[PDB]
Design a protein around this ligand. Sequence first.
Ligand SMILES: Nc1ncnc2c1c(Cl)cn2[C@@H]1O[C@H](CO)[C@@H](O)[C@H]1O
Ligand SMILES: [Co+2]
Ligand code: NA
Length: 338
Amino acid sequence: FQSMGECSQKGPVPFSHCLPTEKLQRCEKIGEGVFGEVFQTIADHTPVAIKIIAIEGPDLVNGSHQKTFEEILPEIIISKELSLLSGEVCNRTEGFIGLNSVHCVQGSYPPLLLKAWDHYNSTKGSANDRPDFFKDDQLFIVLEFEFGGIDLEQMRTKLSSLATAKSILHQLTASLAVAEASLRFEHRDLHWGNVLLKKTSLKKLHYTLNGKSSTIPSCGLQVSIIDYTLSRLERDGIVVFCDVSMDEDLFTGDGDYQFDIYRLMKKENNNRWGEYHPYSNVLWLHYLTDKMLKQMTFKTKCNTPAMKQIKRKIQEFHRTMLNFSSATDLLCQHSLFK
Ligand SMILES: Nc1ncnc2c1c(Cl)cn2[C@@H]1O[C@H](CO)[C@@H](O)[C@H]1O
Ligand SMILES: [Co+2]
Ligand code: NA
């Protein structure tokens, strides 16, 4: 059965099942990675994001081998578990992205998606191969997500002030804490492409951690965490994760603190990726705080002592947070969030 038993179709479906004519025609490419492609479209007046990953074939795609179904299952499972936290009671958060559906699709790549791919290449430039070489027996996983807004990297020059950065860090820490508490979750790849920002009219956002509800001032933005390709969690003691113990390349990057975080995770976990080490979530939050202070540039600087104090408190968070054991420890004990 398709979509984890929430679609009545059995066996692979064509692209047109997921992308009927008007939905396909409205696709625009919004992102990419070695994994594949991300398109935005609209259905029932509501934007969605469609992540398309080739699986099970022998061709290199963007320079790498395609995952098998067994290899892609963890991202599918984790996407669903994290989405479901929006509807839970004891441990509840909307800070992970909604998952609408997941399909296994068979076919060559739609010409209309190639048109969108071309437009992105012509305007932004792509690091990927044009995905025009797939045959009619090719399998894909198509994940349809809630549209989460714009990634923090693309918002480098677009945020109002460091007050907004504080909200963003609080939202991220709370979401991670709730997922720790519910699922013994580690994201493991929370670079600034994976933090999405969308406008909200809500003044406060709500979460529940181990039965205790609280709120976070939004500063007009709702944060969504995406991309569970490297993530880990467990349910009733059964662990789902990406075993990267034998990966060379993941640990040899340079030129950004991001690449150090991979090495620092490996140090923390002794290269045993099945274990639960929620300190990895602290390391990613440190990397994001570091981006907030060193790479983000804000429309309004910290011009008054009250704004300079927010800046100082974020600097203080940066210099103290590595002494906390988990996002839960940070949320519950760090002075930034009191
Ligand atoms: N649900 C989303 N809503 C909005 N943008 C999204 C997504 C996803 Cl998933 C990915 N992206 C974009 O694609 C890139 C590669 O994954 C990300 O960095 C986002 O820009
Ligand atoms: Co379906
Ligand atoms: Na969200």
